[PDB]
Symmetry: C3
Subunit: 307 residues, 3 copies
């Protein structure tokens, strides 16, 4: 038997900022306990007879299938609903007529607002263009904790288009608010820096906790050697676009200067910014990261729906 | 435990006209009994190991998801089959190779004929262009009965394009044949009246039962005040199309003259003919109507497949 | 309870050539034992909590739905994954993060190679353009055995575009390698003969077993009368295309010369090469063939995943 994280009971999950550090600790432990259980071949039937409907206005097969698999590995059911129109509100009401939990993926933050304005069952926000992707943030935290043993104390590099990558903005805010980080490296090509508004947002936390923040335009052996986590992201189309790829690339040559105890992570999909020539390195955690996503989403759904 | 409606055992459900009043009474009671059970958190596993395949040649996510959710809340399984060609008959045979029940949605009444000409398992007709939508008719009846306590005795207004709305033709025929209605108001813009052939069809029943039939081109305070059910439908594109909307619109101003004990219904989707400014009124039943659809479809599937 | 075919445990199923005659015998018996069980109304729950993900880059609703239904009738779960790009390898890794078994349908044999190069769970090959369609071959063998009582000893006609029909190449290789056939008729229009390389491939087996091989450009009463199986396939677009259809057509007139104890088979879909005027003939086995496909795929999945 598992103990649900009681603060999530019957609650929509809109932003990772709605959780305390204690909530996150509890979700991490529950996800790991389920991982041990499931990987031992034992099953979970607690959500038998409960129905999830995903409503995905943009394709994200990676995130969608994880939510669906999480629901089914708890014994629950999943009903598809093809987006076909009528108002989004009326569509949500249609889902509520037969569902226990909704999973919404829409680029507009307004859509989540509108959905929650009428929904009678919990909505899981599966990601939007405002950078609120609560289960990605939480699975990223779980991955660090499970791979290294702790999140407190780490040096982490956030690597990519930090200007436009609003999901990484949210990840930084969550990490700085909840964990005693040692250092955050912000690695981005010239002109794609983390926005000043985000640094202002975390300033209270960074100064209370004494977290070092360092901006640079590329990786160096010294930065790599200092990091416990290299967190890479995809650069999507500046006149130095192709030329800047070499300074962010993580490959076998780059990992020559890395610690023995560190991980490389990436929310995926990747293009060329993460070479396949480290895919078999024990520190390459970005595939296991997806499996941590399965168990974090099980921990969340179990806690939301257990009664 | 639940008692199946025995007359449905192993039978395709092609038209609501195939049921007696006793069948409808029994399906209503079974749907309500399942509603109490399910909403108490209890589950149903009777159809474990049975397979439904929906075959939808036109999109209707509202009707499709209801059938799928109904099947899964009975413990059954659902297999998708994307329409890709080969004959419809060969496709049906393909579904029968592994399914226990088929759900067919096709605009042509010929398609249901062809499917039943070769099918070896029951087919649930999910709606066609001839107006045969048996589970919509039955869920509409359940909604009235559950919301008001009875269908016998009601005055109901059917509002919209009554000329082309063949599904409403079927609803009127079913109501007049099986229930002691007091009165039916037929509210339609000029030129979109209920066809004379439909009034001729119900004439035997209307005269045996003494049902009043009244045609009008718009709602009035007197008609509204007299009705137990306002059943609205969508007007799809006459030179007075936009101008006629005001005479059919149901909004807060219109409900000022309505009874305390009445409901507004709509099979959905709606555009503007049903204002959001009554969506929180207790008499607005068109969202609960969809949940009655879930339990009516469970009652039907349970009765068809229980052995 | 059922005994799994132990040689399949935890193994990807890439080609029917990976099985011994003993494996095939065992899979046939297991499929038939499951058929009796399931058709008696008894259920199977052995794979409760196990997840299948199909990844279909080409449409084949017939093969896809059979795999999904097989999984669910063993108690297992199915998660869809819409092909959306990222490498196929990264997509496979994504499926492995939450799945127990993958089902791959891709036209390129290279795709199966690439998938197996990184997959950590078994992959079921659902068919490719190299003619490797292991569950079609195995269900075809099961159909013959179940319908006639044995595969050893038969005369079979393979009818269609034998040049380009690479799946039929594989079927011939499998039959000649594993069964004491009496005779294979190769019926194909001029220029569409079975390739010489395939006859060279089976030569060792045909001479050890004494199997007769006979090429002809059309069916005749003498060939029809001699066959235990007429295995027809679809001709897809030579200046004699339409004209050659009459010499391959199987209809009621053609079956006038057939044995009482024989079957007509076809992997499906068909166009006109198999008339509907034999669809009710007891020897028309091509619809039952699909149901044998369900139980063969259950036997396979059960054996792959039982632990």
């Amino acid at each position: 038997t598992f103990n649900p994280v009681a603060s999530l009971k019957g609650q929509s999950v809109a932003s990772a900022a709605q959780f305390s550090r204690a909530d996150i600790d509890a979700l991490i432990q529950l996800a790991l306990d389920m991982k041990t259980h499931i990987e031992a071949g034992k099953t979970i039937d607690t959500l038998r007879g409960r129905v999830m409907t995903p409503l995905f206005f943009e394709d994200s097969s990676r995130t969608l299938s994880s939510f669906c698999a999480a629901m089914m590995r708890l014994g629950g059911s999943v009903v598809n609903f093809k987006v076909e129109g009528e108002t989004l509100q009326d569509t949500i009401r249609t889902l509520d007529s037969y569902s226990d939990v909704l999973v919404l993926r829409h680029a507009k933050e307004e859509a989540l607002e509108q959905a929650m304005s009428v929904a009678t069952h919990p909505i899981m926000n599966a990601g939007n263009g405002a950078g609120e992707h609560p289960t990605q943030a939480l699975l990223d935290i779980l991955t660090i904790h499970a791979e290294l043993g702790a999140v407190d104390g780490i040096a982490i590099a956030l690597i990519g288009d930090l200007k436009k990558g609003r999901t990484v903005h949210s990840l930084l805010k969550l990490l700085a608010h909840n964990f005693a980080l040692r250092k955050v490296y912000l690695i981005a090509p010239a002109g794609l820096e983390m926005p000043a508004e985000v640094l202002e947002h975390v300033a209270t936390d960074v100064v209370k906790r004494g977290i070092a923040i360092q901006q640079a335009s590329g990786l160096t052996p010294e930065i790599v050697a200092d990091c416990d986590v290299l967190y890479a992201t995809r650069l999507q189309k500046l006149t130095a676009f192709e030329a800047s790829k070499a300074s962010l690339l993580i490959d076998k040559a780059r990992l020559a200067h890395a610690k023995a105890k560190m991980v490389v992570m990436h929310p995926l999909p990747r293009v060329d910014e993460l070479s396949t020539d480290i895919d078999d390195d024990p520190r390459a955690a970005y595939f296991r990261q997806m499996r941590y996503g399965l168990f974090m989403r099980m921990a969340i759904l179990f806690s939301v729906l257990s009664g």
